[PDB]
Ligand binder design. Structure first.
Ligand SMILES: Nc1ncnc2c1ncn2[C@@H]1O[C@H](COP(=O)(O)OP(=O)(O)O)[C@@H](O)[C@H]1O
Ligand SMILES: [Mg+2]
Length: 415
């Protein structure tokens, strides 16, 4: 960022600001479970308003609608409502993010107008791909992508990107906006500065804790991370891929990444060569279906998971092994709950791991927890202030740990 235009050097007096934020907040039945990512953008938004912005037009994705409109499942409308509360200002919600009606509402707003656009991923051109409404994979057309970007660019005179949590995504709203000044917000500044200091020479041992459910994405990041860390917990939804390939463990209907499976053995060889201690769980809480009211069971690696059942949390021997890796660390980066922590039957391991990480912070371990869902763990159990840093970035944070530049940063104007 030292090299890039940032919002503190952007003259906004009388300008419309179009601002990409990560408002991809966790939900249960169109209710916001954690407004952390919303609050995190407020400093950038208030700056613009305080310094005389004509308008701030906010844009984000929510979940993975795959390029089809899904207002019933994936609308940002609840986020506009929560934003109102957080800003003390009213927020005009629009039901689309591009096209003539949107351009019109954004062309010349009343001074101080805050506008939140609908889910960008209701359009295929944001990601550059998705699925048609029948579930068949489609790829977007370049001339349509270009038009999508041109339409977004009409909505502001100047562009800010404060979407740290999405900064690893080279999507239209993140790298494609064509305006003369493209400036990083304060949340991006705050996050890049923390990780720059913490990644420069990590305290050792440096433990990465990888869990969660986006197994196809995350498994592809392990290879570079193995040059940076001394230990790695591979837990949550990611473990099953590894145990299937390594132990031939019967995993039931647990998450499994078919492509990921093909590099597991390569990753474990690299880990052995780099002296990275891999800790996989050894036991599970199982469920007879993917429901919070499912019947619960126990499984071990040796027993396997029964057919039709899925592992949704680690068990007590796993928690103990996770605790011992946490006890040995001087620095930790954790992204991905180690169970379906949202559901109380499957929350105990993630809760146990959190208690250990809080303890560790107390004896001077540098502890970093990131992700839309992993940070919600901290909100759930009131630990946001009992670890060293809660980041709004999960996958974005792991890509920094890999040593990469984030495209959403790299696309900003130079100083
Ligand atoms: N064994 C599992 N099977 C399915 N989902 C899991 C498992 N363990 C954790 N999860 C889920 O992982 C999700 C979070 O994954 P992810 O989005 O990758 O993390 P973050 O948002 O912190 O980057 C949670 O919603 C949680 O329910
Ligand atoms: Mg997530």
């Amino acid at each position: 960022l030292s090299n890039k235009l940032t919002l503190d050097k952007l003259d906004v007096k009388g300008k419309r600001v179009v601002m990409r934020v990560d408002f991809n907040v966790p939900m249960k039945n169109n209710q916001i479970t954690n407004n952390q990512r919303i609050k995190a953008a407020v400093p950038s938004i208030k700056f613009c308003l305080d310094n005389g912005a004509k308008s701030v037009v906010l844009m984000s994705h929510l979940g993975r609608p795959d390029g089809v409109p899904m207002p019933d499942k994936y609308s940002l409308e609840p986020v506009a409502v929560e934003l109102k509360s957080l800003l003390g200002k009213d927020v005009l919600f629009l039901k689309d993010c591009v096209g003539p009606e949107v351009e019109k509402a954004c062309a010349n707003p009343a001074a101080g107008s805050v506008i939140l656009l609908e889910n960008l991923r209701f359009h295929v051109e944001e990601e550059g791909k998705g699925k048609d409404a029948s579930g068949n994979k489609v790829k977007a057309e370049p001339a349509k992508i270009e038009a999508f970007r041109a339409s977004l660019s009409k909505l502001g005179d100047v562009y800010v990107n404060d979407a740290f949590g999405t900064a690893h995504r080279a999507h239209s709203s993140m790298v494609g906006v064509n305006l003369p000044q493209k400036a990083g917000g304060f949340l991006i500044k705050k996050e890049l500065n923390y990780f720059a200091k913490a990644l420069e020479s990590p305290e050792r041992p440096f433990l990465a804790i990888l869990g969660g459910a986006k197994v196809a994405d995350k498994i592809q990041l392990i290879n570079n991370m193995l040059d940076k860390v001394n230990e790695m917990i591979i837990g949550g939804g990611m473990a099953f891929t590894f145990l299937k390939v390594l132990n031939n463990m019967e995993i039931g209907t647990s998450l499994f990444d078919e492509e990921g499976a093909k590099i597991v053995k390569d990753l474990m060889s690299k880990a052995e060569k780099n002296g990275v201690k891999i800790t996989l769980p050894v036991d599970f809480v199982t469920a007879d279906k993917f429901d919070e009211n499912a019947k619960t069971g126990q499984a071990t690696v040796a027993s396997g998971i029964p057919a039709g059942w899925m592992g949704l949390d680690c068990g007590p021997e796993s928690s103990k092994k996770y605790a011992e890796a946490v006890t040995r660390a001087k620095q930790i980066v954790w992204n991905g709950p180690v169970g379906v922590f949202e559901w109380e039957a499957f929350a105990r391991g993630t809760k146990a791991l959190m208690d250990e990480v809080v303890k560790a912070t107390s004896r001077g371990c540098i502890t970093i927890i990131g992700g839309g869902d992993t940070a919600t763990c901290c909100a759930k159990w009131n630990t946001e202030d009992k670890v060293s840093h809660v980041s709004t970035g999960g996958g974005a944070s792991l890509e920094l740990l890999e040593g990469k530049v984030l495209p959403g940063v790299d696309a900003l104007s130079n100083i």
